[PDB]
C-alpha cells in the first residue's frame, strides 16, 4: 500500500490551472514547492513517481525531473526503454501498479492534466491533495482542476504569501472519514490520562477551573472544522475569536438597546508582510475604511465630511437626537467633538466646535510618532493614544481603539499593537483590523519601512444578538487567501494619501453580509 | 497487561502525606478527585482495584469503597471470604497478579502507605503517578511519599486551586523514556503531511513565513519540557514567554547601556479566582510590590517615601545624576514627576514639585473608576491610563504599564486587562503581574466583587543580556502551586490598605535569584 497524492495549483474561484499549454501565472516559490513536495521521501534508496498526462509532459519540455520518475499517460507516445526516469502507460489505472511493485517507488504523485486529475479522483485513486490556491481570477483559462469530491476534507491552510503582488495559499486535503464526533480542541487526544484528569477536575470544580470559563468552540460554530492542526491562515484569528465568544460569551445588556454576548481580554495576530488582512469570508468596504482613516489623520472631527464621501458610520452617533440624549444638544448636527484625530493631532487641545481652526493647539502625537519612529526606531515609546480623561465628556463616543504602540524590527519592518476597550466583532472589528493595517502601512512608507505584524488586544470582545444569524452564515464560508494592498505613489506627508493612491489586488471575498448597528 | 497507577497527595516541599493515621489536611475536592480517578473505568462489567497498606485500610475505617475492590497488604490480617469487595494479600508482589487474572479488574491503583508506595516504586510496579501537591509545609508529618524515581516524567500540571485558603495542584507523572529528541511544539506530530509541508514551505520562504518569526522554544530553554500537552499551571504563561523571547528575541540596544533580546506583542493570562499569581520559580518580594502600589494609589510621586519603606526600585531613575541627564536637573533629589499615581489621581494636573498639595487638581481616574465600577458594572469604559502626551517630558520615566481596563463578569468577578508598552521580563514583569493582581483585588473588595482574571498584553517584551544566566537557572525549576493572598479586613476607602492587612498564605518559592537593573 503506497500513497497517492495530487499536487496542483488552481485559481481561487474557478480553479483554473492552465492556458494554452502553460500555467496562467508565474510564481517560483510554487514551482519550488512543487519540487520540494514531490521530491520529499524517507528512503534514500527509493524514488517518488510523478504521473502526468501527455500534454503536461509536453509542458515540461519532455525532460525528466531530477531524482524522480515521470510516468506519462498517453495512448500514442512510444513505450521506450531509452530514458529510465521516464516511463509511458496506456491508461491511468495500469500505471497505478507503481503500488503493486517497484518497491523502489516510495510515493506516488498525480501531477496533472485536467483529464488525469478528473480521472484520478473519479476512480478513487488519490489519498491526498496538495492545493496551491492562486489569487488571480479575471484572466483566460482553458484547463481546470475538478471540484474536490466530498470524501475529501481540508486539514491545513497556510497563511497567505505574495509574489509579484499575487496572493496565494497552500492547503492539504485528506481523504478521511472513518470517525464520529471528534473533539475540535487540538490539545485533547494527546494522552487519555491528561484528558480524563482534566475532565474529572472539570466536574469537581466548575466555573472554578479557569479552563471551564474558556471552553473550546463546539464543532457547529467552528469555521472549517476539519482543519484542526493547520489553521495557519490568519483570518482564523478573527473567525476563531468569533467562535470563542459564541461558545463562552456571557449574555449582557449595554448602553445600546441590543444585548451582546461577550468575553473579556482576547487577542488577534495578523501578518502584513506577505498580505493585507481584509477578511475574505465577507466582502469588506475598503474605501469607507480608508476615508475614515485619513479623516482621523487630518485631525478632522466633522462628521459631515464623512457623509459627503458617502461614509455613514458616524451618522448614528452624530445625529441631533443622539447628541441631545447624551447632553451635547448645544452641538451642531454632526460635530462629533474631540474624538479620535482631534486627540491624534491635538491632544489636550481645548475643543470649541468642528469649525474652529486648531492649527497649533494641543500635542501632535501623530507628528511626534512619525518623527520619533524614524529618528529613534529602537525606542520603546512609539505610542499613540486617544484616551483623554479630560475630554471624554465632550466626545460623541469614547475611543474604542484606545491606544496603539509601534515597533520597528531589526529588519526594518514596522509592527503595530492596538488595545481596543470595546469591540463589535460582527460590525466594527473587520474594519478596525483593516484600518490599523493601513495606518501601519502609511506610517511605514512615510518613515521608510515596510509593514511587519499587527496584533490586536481586545477588552470587551462581543457579538450583538442581532448578528447571530449573519455571523453563523459567515462562519460557514471557508477562507480564501488574503488580498494585497499597495500604494501607487510615495506620498511626502502622511496626510497627502488619497483613495486613488490605493490598490487592492486580488480580493475575491464571499458576498457581503448585511449587519445593522445599534445606536 | 493491566495499568498500575499511584494516587497520592503530598505537601509541596517535603512530600508529607500523613500524621497520626490521618491526612495532614482536609480538602474535599481532593477526596472527590481521588474517588473520580480510582473509579474511572471503560468496562461497566469490570472494576478497578485499590491496593493499600493495612494502616491505610485502618484509615478508611475498614469499610469498602463503592464500585471498587480494596486489596489490603498485611502479614496478619485474615484472608477472609466475607466481604467480596475486600481481599487480603501477604506481600505486594503477589497481590499484583490482579494483572495475571481477574479480567474483571480493569485497572490497578496503588493507594497508599509510605511503605506500599516506596515498595511499589522500588519493584518497578507502577506505570503512572497522580500527585496532588498540597501547599502547607510547616506542620507535623510522620508519613511521606518517596521521591519520584527519574524514570518518571511529569506530563501534566493543573492550575492552582484553593480550599480553606490552602493551595494545591494536580499533576500526572508517566513512566516514559523510549524516545529521542521529540519536538516540544504540541502542534507537530499530529500528521506528517502538515508537518512536512510546513517545513518545506518554511524552507522556500524564510523569515517571510510568519511562523518562522515565531519559532517554538527549543527544549533546552523550555521549562519542565516533559509537560507538553498539560502546561495548565498559569506560571507557564510567564515561563513560556521567557522561553519565547530566548528563542526569537532580536538583539537590540536601548536607552540603558545594556542590550536586550526582544519580541513585539505578547500575552499572559492569570487566574485570580483560585490563587494569586506570585511566581514560585523564584522568590518575589511581595512587600515591596505592595508598598509601590499604595504609593501609586495615593497619587504620591515622592521617591523618598519608597526609600523610607525600604523599597529602592525608583532610586535609579530618581537620582540627581539621572534627572540632570534627562534635563530635569532643577528637580529635587527624588521628585520623580507626574508619573503613575499622579496621573491616576490627578490626570492632566499641572505639576510643580512632589511637595505641593494637588488635592482637587486634575482628573481623579481611580476615584471615577471605582465609582463607575459599582454604579455601572456592565459598562465598557472602565479605564485607567497613565499615558499623558503632555506630561511625558516631566516624568523621570514614561509609563510602562500604560493602560488598564476593568471588566465585571456576570457572576460578579472583577477581571483586569493591562497593556504594557515595555516590559523587563527578568526584573520587572514578575512584579507587574503581582502588582496589578493586587490592585484588582483591592478594586474588587472596595466595589463589592471578587477577583476574576488577569490578562497582560506586552508591547516590547524583552530580556536584558545580563539576566541570561539568572533566567536560565530560573527556567530549570519546576513550578509549585501558586499561593493565596487575602485581606485581613474590609477597608472602606482603597487608600486605607496597609501592609498588615495582607496575608500571603502558602507561598513556597525557590530561592531568590539576584538580577540587576539597568539605569
Ligand atoms: N496548475 C497546475 O497545478 C497544473 C497545470 N497544468 C496545465 O494543464 C494543461 C495540461 O493539461 P490538460 O490539457 O488536461 O492535458 P493533460 O496533461 O491531461 O494531458 C492530456 C493527455 O494525456 C493523455 N490521456 C489523458 N487521459 C487518458 C486516458 N484516459 N487514457 C490514455 N491517455 C490519456 C492523452 O494524450 P494522448 O493524446 O497522447 O493519448 C491526453 O491528450 C496545461 O496548460 C498545463 O500548464 C498541468 C499540470 C498542473
Ligand atoms: N496523602 C495521601 O495520598 C495518603 C496518605 N496516607 C497516610 O499515610 C499513613 C498510613 O500509611 P503508613 O503509616 O505507611 O502505613 P501503610 O498504609 O503503608 O501501612 C503499613 C502496613 O501495611 C502492611 N505492609 C507494609 N509493607 C508490607 C510488606 N512488605 N509485607 C507485608 N505487609 C506489609 C503492614 O501491616 P501488617 O503490620 O498488619 O502486616 C504495615 O504495618 C496515614 O497517616 C494515612 O493517612 C495513606 C494513603 C494516602
Ligand atoms: C502546486 C503545483 N502543482 C503543480 C503540478 C504540476 C505542474 C506541472 C508543470 C508546472 C510548470 N512547469 C514546470 C516545468 C518544469 C519544472 C517545473 C514546472 C518545476 N520544476 C522544478 C521546480 C522548480 C524549480 O527548480 O525551482 C522541479 O524540481 O520539479 C521543473 O523543472 C507546474 C505544476 C505545478 C505547479 O506549478 N504547482
Ligand atoms: C454598536 C456599534 N457602534 C459603532 C459606532 C461607531 C463606529 C465607528 C466606526 C466603526 C468601525 N469603522 C467602520 C468603518 C466603515 C464602516 C463600518 C465600520 C461599518 N460599515 C457598514 C456600513 C455603514 C453602517 O453600517 O451604517 C458596513 O457593514 O458596510 C461601514 O461602512 C464602528 C462603529 C460602531 C460599531 O462598530 N458598532
Ligand atoms: C490524591 C489522593 N490520593 C489518595 C490516596 C489514598 C488515600 C487514602 C485515604 C485518604 C483519606 N481517607 C479516606 C477515607 C474514606 C474515603 C476517602 C478517603 C475517600 N472516599 C470517597 C471519596 C470522598 C467523597 O465521598 O467525597 C471514595 O469514594 O473513595 C472515602 O470513602 C485519602 C487518600 C488520598 C487522597 O486523599 N488524595
Ligand atoms: C531597567 C528597568 N528599570 C526600571 C525602572 C523602574 C521600575 C519601577 C518598577 C518596576 C516594577 N516594580 C517593582 C517593584 C518592586 C521591586 C522590583 C520591581 C524589583 N525589585 C528588586 C529589588 C529592588 C531593586 O532591584 O533595586 C527585586 O528583584 O527584588 C523590587 O523590589 C520596574 C522598574 C524597572 C525595571 O523593571 N527595569
Ligand atoms: O472602531 C470602532 C468604533 C466603536 N465600536 C463599537 C464597539 C461597541 O459595540 C460600541 C461602543 O460601545 P461602548 O464602548 O460605547 O459601550 O461601538 C467598534 O467596535 N469599533
Ligand atoms: O512597572 C515597570 C516599570 C518600568 N519597567 C521597565 C521596562 C523597561 O525595561 C524599562 C523602561 O524602558 P524604556 O521604556 O524607558 O525604554 O523599565 C517595567 O518592566 N515595569
Amino acid at each position: 500500500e503506497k500513497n497517492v497524492s495530487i499536487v496542483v495549483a488552481a485559481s481561487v474561484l474557478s480553479s483554473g490551472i492552465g492556458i494554452n499549454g502553460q500555467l496562467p501565472w508565474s510564481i517560483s516559490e510554487d514551482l519550488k514547492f512543487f519540487s520540494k513536495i514531490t521530491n520529499n521521501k524517507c528512503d534514500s534508496n527509493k524514488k517518488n513517481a510523478l504521473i502526468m498526462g501527455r500534454k503536461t509532459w509536453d509542458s515540461i519540455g519532455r525532460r525528466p525531473l531530477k531524482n524522480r520518475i515521470i510516468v506519462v499517460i498517453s495512448s500514442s507516445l512510444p513505450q521506450d526503454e531509452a530514458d529510465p526516469n521516464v516511463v509511458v502507460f496506456r491508461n491511468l489505472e495500469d500505471s497505478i501498479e507503481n503500488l503493486m511493485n517497484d518497491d523502489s517507488i516510495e510515493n506516488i504523485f498525480v501531477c496533472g492534466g485536467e483529464s488525469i486529475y478528473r480521472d484520478a479522483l473519479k476512480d478513487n485513486f488519490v489519498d491526498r491533495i496538495y492545493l496551491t490556491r492562486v489569487a488571480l481570477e479575471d484572466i483566460e483559462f482553458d484547463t481546470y482542476f475538478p471540484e474536490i469530491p466530498e470524501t475529501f476534507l481540508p486539514v491545513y491552510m497556510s497563511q497567505t504569501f505574495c509574489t509579484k503582488n499575487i496572493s496565494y495559499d497552500f492547503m492539504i486535503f485528506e481523504k478521511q472519514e472513518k470517525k464520529t464526533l471528534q473533539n475540535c480542541d487540538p490539545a485533547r487526544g494527546q494522552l487519555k490520562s491528561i484528558d480524563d484528569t482534566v475532565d474529572l477536575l472539570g466536574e469537581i470544580f466548575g466555573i472554578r477551573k479557569m479552563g471551564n470559563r474558556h471552553k473550546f468552540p463546539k464543532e457547529e460554530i467552528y469555521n472549517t472544522p476539519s482543519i484542526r492542526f493547520g489553521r495557519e491562515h490568519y483570518e482564523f484569528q478573527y473567525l476563531d475569536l468569533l467562535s470563542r465568544v459564541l461558545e463562552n460569551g456571557a449574555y449582557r445588556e449595554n448602553r445600546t438597546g441590543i444585548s451582546t454576548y461577550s468575553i473579556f481580554g482576547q487577542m488577534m495576530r495578523f501578518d502584513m508582510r506577505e498580505s493585507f488582512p481584509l477578511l475574505t469570508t465577507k466582502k469588506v468596504a475598503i474605501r469607507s475604511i480608508f476615508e475614515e482613516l485619513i479623516w482621523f489623520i487630518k485631525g478632522d472631527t466633522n462628521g459631515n465630511h464623512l457623509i459627503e464621501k458617502k461614509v455613514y458610520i458616524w451618522s448614528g452617533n452624530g445625529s441631533k437626537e443622539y447628541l441631545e440624549r447624551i447632553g451635547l444638544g448645544h452641538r451642531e448636527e454632526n460635530d462629533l467633538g474631540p474624538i479620535y484625530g482631534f486627540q491624534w493631532r491635538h491632544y489636550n487641545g481645548e475643543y470649541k466646535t468642528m469649525h474652529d481652526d486648531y492649527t497649533g493647539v494641543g500635542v501632535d502625537q501623530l507628528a511626534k510618532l512619525i518623527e520619533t519612529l524614524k529618528n529613534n526606531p529602537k525606542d520603546r515609546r512609539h505610542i499613540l493614544t486617544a484616551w483623554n480623561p479630560s475630554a471624554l465628556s465632550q466626545m460623541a463616543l469614547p475611543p474604542c481603539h484606545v491606544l496603539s504602540q509601534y515597533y520597528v524590527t531589526n529588519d526594518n519592518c514596522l509592527s503595530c499593537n492596538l488595545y481596543q476597550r470595546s469591540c463589535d466583532l460582527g460590525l466594527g472589528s473587520p474594519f478596525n483590523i483593516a484600518s490599523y493595517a493601513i495606518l501601519t502601512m502609511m506610517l511605514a512608507q512615510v518613515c521608510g519601512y515596510e509593514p511587519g505584524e499587527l496584533a490586536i488586544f481586545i477588552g470587551d470582545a462581543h457579538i450583538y444578538e442581532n448578528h447571530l444569524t449573519q455571523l453563523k452564515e459567515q462562519l460557514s464560508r471557508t477562507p480564501r487567501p488574503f488580498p494585497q494592498l499597495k500604494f501607487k505613489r510615495k506620498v511626502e506627508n502622511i496626510e497627502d494619501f488619497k483613495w486613488e493612491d490605493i490598490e487592492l489586488i486580488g480580493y475575491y471575498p464571499y458576498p457581503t453580509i448585511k449587519m445593522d448597528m445599534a445606536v
Side-chain angles (χ1 to χ4, degrees), chain A residues 35 64 192 272 286 306 395:
Chain A
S35 186
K192 192 161 91 169
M272 290 187 290
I286 184 68
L306 262 292
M395 299 168 89

Side-chain angles (χ1 to χ4, degrees), chain A residues 255 340 397-398 400-401 420-424 428-429 432 462 464:
Chain A
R255 59 151 203 113
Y340 312 102
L397 195 59
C400 279
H401 36 114
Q420 192 168 187
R421 70 178 182 66
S422 184
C423 181
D424 174 348
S429 190
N432 288 90
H462 54 276
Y464 282 93

